[PDB]
Curated annotation (Swiss-Prot), chain B:
Changing Q31H: In strain: A23.1. Attaches the virion to the cell membrane by interacting with host receptor, initiating the infection. The major receptor is host ACE2. When S2/S2' has been cleaved, binding to the receptor triggers direct fusion at the cell membrane. When S2/S2' has not been cleaved, binding to the receptor results in internalization of the virus by endocytosis using host TFRC and GRM2 and leading to fusion of the virion membrane with the host endosomal membrane. Alternatively, may use NRP1/NRP2 and integrin as entry receptors. This is Spike protein S1. The gene is S. Binds to host ACE2. RBD also interacts with the N-linked glycan on 'Asn-90' of ACE2. Cleavage of S generates a polybasic C-terminal sequence on S1 that binds to host Neuropilin-1 (NRP1) and Neuropilin-2 (NRP2) receptors. Interacts with host integrin alpha-5/beta-1 (ITGA5:ITGB1) and with ACE2 in complex with integrin alpha-5/beta-1 (ITGA5:ITGB1). May interact via cytoplasmic c-terminus with M protein. May interact (via N-terminus) with host bilirubin and biliverdin, thereby preventing antibody binding to the SARS-CoV-2 spike NTD via an allosteric mechanism. Glycans are attached at N21, N34. It comes from the Viruses.
Amino acid sequence: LPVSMTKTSVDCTMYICGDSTECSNLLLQYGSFCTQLKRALTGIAVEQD
Amino acid sequence: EILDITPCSFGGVSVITPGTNTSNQVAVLYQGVNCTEVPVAIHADQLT
């Protein structure tokens, strides 16, 4: 029987824009998607513990 | 001359605090990096 799974945290800025696109500051115009995904990932991480 | 392109050293910053009702000291956690890849530029913090 499984108990826990892999806890994953995702950096949305490096995934969507990248580590080389400093001109991609338009992700702040979309609002708070990264916060509401990081909250769900943090809840999953504290649930697996 | 062919060269690898490895990305920059990055990670997540997690602040550990006992609460503002107790004290104001905080401890940071740089997730996924070594003790040498953390910024040792504390003497030059005004350069950002």
